[PDB]
Write a protein that binds this ligand. Structure first.
Ligand SMILES: Cc1c[nH]c(=O)[nH]c1=O
Ligand code: SF4
Ligand code: SF4
Lengths: 1010, 1012
């Protein structure tokens, strides 16, 4: 047969494989119109009717992210200095830091940083109107691809943290409860269990107050987050999670207790001995219109205050166990108002079975004050919008509303809004919902706030800096104060109040507080994990250090690095005065190793830098100063001489006399040209230094060697106490199209070979560390080469390194990445002790079936029926889903536990010393690998996005083993798979393709039998 | 002094540098409300009134891309098989291939593929309502980050090609014009110079027809693209560009000639010997309403057909011989209708000075015709929308409009639309613009189409597959046929018609055509550039070939690669039968070298794969079959033995006997551990093979050696005819958090050291090629290691290699990348002959000041004033720009553009042999680098997006040399800069930072004085 031709059945599998075209393609406009419908993914501008949404409370947020999407978006963020997104966030979240943690896979560190400044971090990630807050300030707005999805990232890290089931702990910087001053046992009352009080109580408990009680009028907690924000934007279990974290600090909540005249008043709290009160009761009553007087729910009239709590009670499992069914709202629905409460009423009405929804507002579209992302949800669900209409009469016939009569409104040219009595609209409707906003009007409630001063709007007056009312022991915040519009601003109000309540209370007990406000951070048992390590007789407080590189150009930067938390630092390599060098410029350039991607996260750098231009005297004095001021931070002096015994002994003695904890010998000196490339040269250098000094020293090995183990062995034979693996990889980063290099020095555009650093050399450095650790068990290794996160650092520890040197990751960012690395490592260690989470990969949950970060409903009639998410298949999916939601109307939904129990560590948290070298057991020669335990690829069709990359890779780089369906664009791996794993490697969807154990007989294809 | 302590002035420059916090931050809600306005970038939802737009015709497209953004978005595209975006494109653009070209920086290749299927490719990139076309089918809709911006990428690549000023050429496959059959001289008439006829005429010219004339009624060309689509969505210079490309093919345009009775008719056309006619006149008349009868423009009434041409003549230089100012549209404007014409009327009325615009339509929001992107332009410019209103009466007082009276509409229970005579609106207005659509009404024009049949819709009937009317010689397409709603569908109508006009004409001359339509592609002189190369006596038709690797697992795969265009291929390395191997699985994994980015563009792979599992008999028979069928494609047999003279001589002789053009010796065999790591072993292996075979052979070198030049030298000394540099780099690609590796093999989850391939190892391979080329001048080198584009291929050729082997870029994609590589290399070479383009870097234009890929205005009052693009500074920028637009109305603004004259090569096009090794002159030792020719960084404040990364990097990795302003977030480089170049290397904006010569003395910072 013709071996080099595909037989017919492979020709058939290859039918959809890309081919070179030699001609333009002919397809009539009519045929194209018909075919368009088959592939359509997005809304059709020509479908006018609502999708069926009755009883469908699935998440409709455009911002929700899965891990794949969050990692992409977090790597996109520029992680800006003095970031305007944080300036534009009411709780001042350090967005740069938490997004850096997500990009580094440290979801715990991101959550800790979110919740440190916002105790409702998850709620706010889901609901913040970010376009009017943090995202409206984002610098990447100035790029075509646009601002960062900050809320979605916040939601994602916070959801992973919620899944970790880790409790909040008492501020570990506090003395124990019995040694707290009496002031902290002051009885504190908060009124209302909404965002403002939850935040205030949280921060007060962080400060150490131990007698905090929130009194809540209703039988549910969470305020509007629970009672009115729809489940399809804010799942109730988020609210319950955040309140659980609060209760970990000891805050008490008492339901069914009202601030009201014959119940709780400021006076009775005072006589009962309460020392401070926070008023966070919001705006409890609807804004009304006299034309609706006497209308009842039975006739079809609701305020938002009637309607949204009814829908919440039906759709939130355990919010209020008592449920009526979804209100019977079939028919045309009129929603009055253009604030964001109106838009939630409209989309909720659709879930009650509304036939059509009209939002009617009395001004124009330009005057809508709802945030665009709220408006877009009602728009895409095909609500109708009627501007310039003010209601006048509700027509009732047969006990039911049948119509509303409006008059047209208009502006003149003084901005006056007029009502034109001769211009009317008679709009038929079965249900009317007024969403004119909320007010405080209950006389018995206001009476209970006596004698605090109220303003013009009958709201309590506060000092906007302190949140104090006219009574110095009574504070107020959130909606009740009429400043905040949002959850995050209400949270911030309680935060702001908490510091001045603390000041007020301490003053009352005769104590002062800091003039600079100091609210504590958020803490969990993860933060107690010990990440110190001992190596070569040295104690490192954590295993992360600055490599000898641009970030250690000056000793003043090492100082700032130690202040930021770095465990150790190398000096820039320095030499004797006779060997002083002079740098050229340009000399450090971005890598081309991952294509024309600019900005954050460069995959490599190339440098043609030399050793330090600063003198040995500068560095030796600097080491003495640094060791004097930072005795617990390890300082390693990096030094270089030529192949000269007196020089190496002189310089190493000088660095030792300066107080360096250890030395690092830079073996890049030219004497095959480098000393580090010759085992005899390295051994001799190491013996010279070993004779000269008593302190530990480490040989820094170059990777540009045939056998790096032979260099490490020679260092160890010469008396080195360990090795640093590795320096940069020799390379040429690239050429412009005219042939000139980059970096190019001088008018001559000259260059020389540089060293490549960063994540592109990580595989080379990992291989070096592992080969050395296996060949020389127990020999200390300092790892360097592409370390940029706690989890990549843990790879090097697992590979045999004891400490972790960093350069490029700081060049890509700044010194504060150390806080990410330390919290990330603590979390990775803590999680190794949790039985319930062993299916995770470090901080990453097991990947569930998902599309656009939202889980695929587990319905029998969707599973395996070959329905991709486009065209007529997508309309069939929607119908199936819609039918299951109708069918679910009739059945009991379970309750979550009254409140969850955290996962308990089942062994002591591993120390760094427990993880070093643990991966070496899996390494071996090729002959130690089983060639009979083979795998094949299998594709989860529910996660596939139909791109055919697996198919193209298997076709032109594999075994032509995948069928790609010409109608559904769904791939199927067949029995000719050889498990090469290329299709998984190129698939855009994490864990859509999985390698599973091959169940069928596996025969190597020999082409022609031997 | 305390050396390790910042002095007060550095502490000051570091004031905004990030620091670890130990406490939560206290900021009042009121203080936050106040500060939010200082940083605000996007629109403020509390603003009910947007800046003056009078006389502002700057581009408002949200999809426009500069090079930085285009490269990022083109890299995001999955470049899908059988792609649904292409299915959803009416012209069937090969979107996968043109976006692949952009991502590889091959903008010529992208434009060629675009214009091959769509002669109005730049117009369409600008105006296609993609959410209802290609982008509506995009698979990345299923991701949170969403669908690809296909139209912007199409626009970007087409704009670059436009800037190259390269002409279209006559289809180079055709015989010379004198040898063309007489049928191709048939007189062809096209009526109307819009998208439909321009397309049809272009494709007919590609087919070889030499006598094509477009008769256009007006004194301007381009149809609605020119007369109505606003300049702030479609610049007229795009239309002029596409028509000049068509004129390159010899198509003739005659303006001021109408299809109409007593002028051009089908009868007069027939009588004058025209053999085919294409009707592309569009819908020339407005759809009218009786309530507007007698209303004239000076009372304030316009149809869209009156108003939009007025704005266009007044905003498009070069359109029209007469210049004119904008219409005087002051006061409140009512636009009637909700198709996209209405939305262009709304936004255009704002450019004319309207105080207020009302879009009033007779159905609801759910019924708006317009694509959402068109609607959003009006919405964001603060137009008001009034639904459910039907006009009933215009109120005229004092001889002009003062109001329009509407009645409310509603849809009855079934679905029919009623009018509520008693529910009225009296809406004050000064100007009314009806946008009810367009029709063909003129009886003089209809009568000139006698006797073709018309349908119910009063429009010419056509076979929708052929575009033929009832008259066999008359075709029609575009708006006139009533199917197309868009520019791209009208272009497609003309493209569809052109094949069947060709069939009809040929048959009239007694000739047949293929039953399979074969429209030619789009060609320029770039396509004639020769990219062949001779090396070691072998002739390569192009320098790109498949490395010995997974893409050459099977010889059937090589066959398909040669069919796709690949110049050469390696067999997977094979051996004698005694040495047969068996692979494990998993064995090839994605790289972690650039982070958790999945899908296209993996920066590396790692493999633990062995040599081929297929027998030497399979491979030798396959080489014979491949060389029999593909004699012009070079086939190199890659072979491996242990260190054994008889084995190497036997295996190389067997491969020679099978007809391999050459051999490649795989030196990975363990005898360091591998043969290729020892010069003496390599020299002996090459000696053995040289004694065994007469064909050329190449030693494949490993980069995992201290000194690769010594191995290369040993191979040369042993008799090798060249070297392949390099194989994969030894590595481990990483572990899971529980410590298990990936790949993980068997129950024990075991692994071994693997080989790293792909762009991550390109610096290593480039070093090896350059260092061998300098040590061994003229010794042939085959490069492998991260080659994934003509641009990167050219780097290796400049570095001394003659041919270019590829693996990982095909693993990342498929075999068709060869077409991108060849057109890319042709364009790179061609552009070296063009003096006018000396300042480009290859295919990249010199970067100019832009924000969001839109050029920043050149206004003295803006530049140097430290106005960044946010907060109150942005507001001041908008007021300055708006005041400058008022001044361009009130001054001498009118000069049509310089008409294009294509750049002419002013030196020979370099051949491959001319560029090989040209970079080597710039390489040397560090001691050859000047230390007086120092540089400093300087920042272009107009391109800065205020992220402060330059500042952070200089602070914590540099010399604390950048001031970062706390109010404007603008950076300034001070004189302490050392030119290290890190700030440029991390800046997200291409060429915002540039390194320039030091003007002041360069003093090395030494910390303490030297002392002796
Ligand atoms: C001195 C020196 C400069 N640059 C590097 O990458 N490594 C070194 O050791
Ligand atoms: S021509 Fe239009 S529809 Fe086709 S790919 Fe380009 S933008 Fe999309
Ligand atoms: S890195 Fe670039 S964009 Fe960012 S502040 Fe510096 S110059 Fe501006």
């Amino acid at each position: 047969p013709v071996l080099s031709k595909d037989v017919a059945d492979i020709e058939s599998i290859l039918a959809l494989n890309p081919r070179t075209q030699s001609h333009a393609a002919l397809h009539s406009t009519l045929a194209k119109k018909l075919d368009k419908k088959h592939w359509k993914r997005n809304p059709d501008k020509n479908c006018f009717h609502c999708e069926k949404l009755e009883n469908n409370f699935d998440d409709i947020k455009h911002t929700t992210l899965g891990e794949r999407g969050a990692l992409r978006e977090a790597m996109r963020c520029l992680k800006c200095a003095d970031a305007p997104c944080q300036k534009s966030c009411p709780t001042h979240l350090d967005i740069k830091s938490f997004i850096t943690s997500i990009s580094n896979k440290n979801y715990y560190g991101a959550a800790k940083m979110i919740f440190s400044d916002n105790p409702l971090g998850l709620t706010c990630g889901m609901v913040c109107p970010t376009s009017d807050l943090c995202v409206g300030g984002c610098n990447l707005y100035a790029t075509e691809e646009g601002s960062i999805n900050i809320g979605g990232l916040q939601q994602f890290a916070s959801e992973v943290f919620k899944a970790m089931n880790i409790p909040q702990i008492r501020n570990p910087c506090l003395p124990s409860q019995e040694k707290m001053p009496e002031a902290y046992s002051a009885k504190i009352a908060l009124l209302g269990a909404g965002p403002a009080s939850i935040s205030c109580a949280s921060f007060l408990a962080r400060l150490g107050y131990s007698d905090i009680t929130i009194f809540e009028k209703q039988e549910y907690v969470g305020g509007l987050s629970t009672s009115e924000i729809p489940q399809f934007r804010l799942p109730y279990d988020v609210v319950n999670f955040e309140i659980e974290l609060m209760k970990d600090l000891g805050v008490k909540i008492i339901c069914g207790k009202s601030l009201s005249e014959n119940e709780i008043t400021l006076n009775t709290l005072k006589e009962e001995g309460y020392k401070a009160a926070f008023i966070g009761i919001g705006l409890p009553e609807p804004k009304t219109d006299d034309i609706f007087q006497g209308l009842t729910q039975d006739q079809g009239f609701y305020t938002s205050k009637d309607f949204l709590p009814l829908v919440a009670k039906s759709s939130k499992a355990g919010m209020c166990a008592c449920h009526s069914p979804l209100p019977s709202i079939r028919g045309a629905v009129i929603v009055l108002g253009a604030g964001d409460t109106a838009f939630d009423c409209a989309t909720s009405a659709l879930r009650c079975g509304a036939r059509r929804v009209f939002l009617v507002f009395r001004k124009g579209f330009v005057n809508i004050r709802a945030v665009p992302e709220e408006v877009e949800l009602a728009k895409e669900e095909k609500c109708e919008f009627l501007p310039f209409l003010s209601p006048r009469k509700v027509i009732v016939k047969g006990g039911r509303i049948v119509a509303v009569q409006f008059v047209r409104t208009e502006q003149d040219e003084t901005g006056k809004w007029n009502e034109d009595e001769d211009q009317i609209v008679h709009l038929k409707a079965d249900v009317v919902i007024s969403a004119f906003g909320s007010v405080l009007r209950d006389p018995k409630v206001k009476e209970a706030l006596s004698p605090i001063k109220f303003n013009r709007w009958d709201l309590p007056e506060v000092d906007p800096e302190t949140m104090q009312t006219s009574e110095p022991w009574v504070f107020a915040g959130g909606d009740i104060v009429g400043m905040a519009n949002t959850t995050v601003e209400s949270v911030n109000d309680g935060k702001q109040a908490s510091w001045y309540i603390h000041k007020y209370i301490q003053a009352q007990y005769g104590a002062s507080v800091s003039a600079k406000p100091e609210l504590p951070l958020f803490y969990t048992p993860v933060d107690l994990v010990d990440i110190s390590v001992e190596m070569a007789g040295l104690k490192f407080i954590n295993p992360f250090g600055l490599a000898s590189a641009a970030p250690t150009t000056s000793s003043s930067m090492i100082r700032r690095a130690f202040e930021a938390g770095w465990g150790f630092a190398l000096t820039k390599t320095f030499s004797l005065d006779k060997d002083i060098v002079t740098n050229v410029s340009p000399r450090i350039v971005r890598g081309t190793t991952s294509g024309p991607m600019y900005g954050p996260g460069q995959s490599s750098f190339l440098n043609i830098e030399l050793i330090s231009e600063k003198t040995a005297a500068y560095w030796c004095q600097s080491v003495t100063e640094l060791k004097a001021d930072f005795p617990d931070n390890i300082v390693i002096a990096s030094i270089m001489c030529s192949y000269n015994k007196n020089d190496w002994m002189e310089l190493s003695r000088k660095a030792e006399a300066s107080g360096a904890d250890a030395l690092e010998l830079n073996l890049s000196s030219p004497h095959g040209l480098a000393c580090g490339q010759d085992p005899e040269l390295v051994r001799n250098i190491c013996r010279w230094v070993r004779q000269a000094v008593q302190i530990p020293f480490f040989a820094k090995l170059t990777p540009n060697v045939t056998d790096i183990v032979s260099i490490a062995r020679a260092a160890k034979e010469g008396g080195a106490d360990g090795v640093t693996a590795t320096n940069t990889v020799s390379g040429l980063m690239g050429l412009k199209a005219d042939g000139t290099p980059w970096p190019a020095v001088g008018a001559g555009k000259r260059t020389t070979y540089g060293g490549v650093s960063g994540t592109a050399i990580r595989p080379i450095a990992l291989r070096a560390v592992t080969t050395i650790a296996r060949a020389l068990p127990g020999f200390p290794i300092l790892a360097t080469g592409g370390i940029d996160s706690a989890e990549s650092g843990l790879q090097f520890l697992h590979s045999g390194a004891s400490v972790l040197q960093v350069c490029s990751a700081v060049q890509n960012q700044d010194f504060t990445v150390i806080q990410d690395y330390c919290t990330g490592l603590k979390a990775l260690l803590y999680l190794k002790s949790i039985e319930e989470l062993q299916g995770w990969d470090g901080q990453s949950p097991g990947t569930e079936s998902h599309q656009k970060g939202k889980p695929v409903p587990r319905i029998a009639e969707l599973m395996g029926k070959k329905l991709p998410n486009f065209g007529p298949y997508l309309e069939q999916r929607k119908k199936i889903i819609a039918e299951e939601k109708m069918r679910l109307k009739e059945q009991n939904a379970a309750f979550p536990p009254l409140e969850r129990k955290p996962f308990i560590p089942k062994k002591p948290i591993p120390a760094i010393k427990d993880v070093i070298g643990k991966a070496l057991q899996y390494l071996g020669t090729f002959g130690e690998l089983s060639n009979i335990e083979q795998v094949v690829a299998v594709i989860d069709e529910e996660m596939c996005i139909n791109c055919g990359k697996c198919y193209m890779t298997c076709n032109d780089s594999g075994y032509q083993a995948i069928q790609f369906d010409p109608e559904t664009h769904l791939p199927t791996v067949t029995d000719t798979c050889t498990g090469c794993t290329l299709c998984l490697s190129v698939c855009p969807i994490i864990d859509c393709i999985r390698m599973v154990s091959r169940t069928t007989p596996y025969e190597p294809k020999r082409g022609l039998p031997l």
